[PDB]
Amino acid sequence: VAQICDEALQYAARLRELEPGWSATPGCQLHDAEQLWLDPLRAQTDETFLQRRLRGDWPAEVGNRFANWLNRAVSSDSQILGSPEAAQWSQELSKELTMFKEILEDERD
């Protein structure tokens, strides 16, 4: 789980940075979560007082959305939901979300 999450983070970082220009535009609903994590550095012609919208945009919306998408697509045991395997999987999913947030929260800093 954490291995696939870290590999997906590295591959999404290496693949989302193909173009050198992107900003707020139409169809940018992913940009509320991946405007700094799953997206490269933006253009350099705007006002200089904008370093707090990407420097402060941590991996809590994008990384939290990735953890919620993982917990909504993949799941745990439903008849054994008090056992330790589902608890270890939930701790692994929380650690994967926190690691993705710590790795992608500095998309402006």
Binding site: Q3, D6, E7, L9, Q10, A13, R14, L15, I103
Partner: protein, 305 residues
Amino acid sequence: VTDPEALLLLPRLSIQNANAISSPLTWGFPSPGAFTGFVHALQRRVGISLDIELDGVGIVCHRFEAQISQPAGKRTKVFNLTRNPLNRDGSTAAIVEEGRAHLEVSLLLGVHGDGLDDHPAQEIARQVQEQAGAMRLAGGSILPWCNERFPAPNAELLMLGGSDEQRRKNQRRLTRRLLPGFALVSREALLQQHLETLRTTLPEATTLDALLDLCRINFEPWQVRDKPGWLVPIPAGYNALSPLYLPGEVRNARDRETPLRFVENLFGLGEWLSPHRVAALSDLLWYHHAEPDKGLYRWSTPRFV
């Protein structure tokens, strides 16, 4: 083995016509012994006018575009070749088969020596880049830099001075300078785990190198064996067989002031993690040990796990 004071860097070394044979029984990536040889050649053409030494080397392998083709819809892959000049009679040449690939890779160098405070950081990084730009790398050339302009700087840091969170800040600078790369370190740990779990039959390491890079299929207790990482069989040095001859004894040598030994090359096991798995970036270095009497030459990755 000396713990470095710096992590010098060369962020995108696009090479062309690299030697993707590397062994008599692998074919993918140029051997890490070639990379340690390149770092030692940089140390010999830089670290004599700077009073430093260079031993560590990182591998990230951003993209790997090979030069292969498959024949007639089969699931094997032949190599494509180069023609050769004609003989005296001018008929055709004895074409021998050698592979060829295209790469780029960054190098995380390690400056062990004391010449870090007698020179500023950008000066030593700039002249190491100016020397590394004119050197064949693994049987292939290094491409220079055009007017795309962005990774033209060559960073450096200082391991000796700083706090824990400041070293994490330098790590967050470096591992975002290397975002799409895939690291490479060799494992004796997993390979001895596979010895001591297959150990009932036979301790032969070749059958379990062959039985580890595999999509294995078994029956009921469809099923394919899984793994957290991406594994590779790489040559991990040399396993010299001959008694060491005196320099003038062996005919047709390279030079007659250093001795020769005849060698079959070893095989270990390597893997491919992202650089964001393992924390400290002194763990991604290829030191190489050597010993005179024991004919065992080896390209280890120490201090790792």
